[PDB]
Amino acid sequence: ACDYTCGSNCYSSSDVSTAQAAGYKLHEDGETVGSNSYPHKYNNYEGFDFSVSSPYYEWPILSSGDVYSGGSPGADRVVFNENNQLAGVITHTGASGNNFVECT
Ligand SMILES: Nc1nc2c(ncn2[C@@H]2O[C@H](COP(=O)(O)O)[C@@H](OP(=O)(O)O)[C@H]2O)c(=O)[nH]1
């Protein structure tokens, strides 16, 4: 089993660890990367009832195992907060518009 599933994108929690971690170091340095420049705040326009406390942050997770390093965000994503606490795994895949659904 994969700790989180976004459609067909199965991901172990370890994977999850190395994505948010990465994205949090870039958040620390205050640096931004990407056309859609990640990391950036994720406002919760969808409103999932999260354990973690806002302010939350959008950051891409690739199914290939590597970290976001510019380019393609793909469609799945990890959201941390200011104290690197994990709020979740949301994905475009399966919802409509530019929605995100939590990854089971
Ligand atoms: N679906 C969604 N997209 C978000 C959220 N927060 C940011 N984004 C996306 O990231 C883009 C870049 O981050 P931004 O929110 O800082 O601009 C946003 O432009 P928008 O603000 O117009 O939504 C939006 O398209 C959110 O809570 N939900």
Curated annotation (Swiss-Prot):
What terms describe the molecular function in GO for this protein? Answer: lyase activity; ribonuclease T1 activity; RNA binding; RNA endonuclease activity
According to UniProt, the reaction catalysed is: [RNA] containing guanosine + H2O = an [RNA fragment]-3'-guanosine-3'-phosphate + a 5'-hydroxy-ribonucleotide-3'-[RNA fragment]
Gene Ontology CC annotations of this record = cell septum; hyphal tip
What's the Enzyme Commission number for this chain? 4.6.1.24
Q: Where is the active site?
A: 40, 58 (proton acceptor), 92 (proton donor)
> Carries keyword Ribonucleoprotein?
no
Keywords, comma-separated and alphabetical: Disulfide bond, Endonuclease, Hydrolase, Lyase, Nuclease, Signal
Keyword Membrane, does the record have it?
no
Give the disulfide map: 2-10, 6-103
User: What's the subunit arrangement here?
Assistant: Monomer.
Could you say which protein family the record assigns here?
A: Belongs to the ribonuclease N1/T1 family.
Stated name of the protein: Guanyl-specific ribonuclease T1
Which span of the parent protein is shown here? 27 to 130 of 130
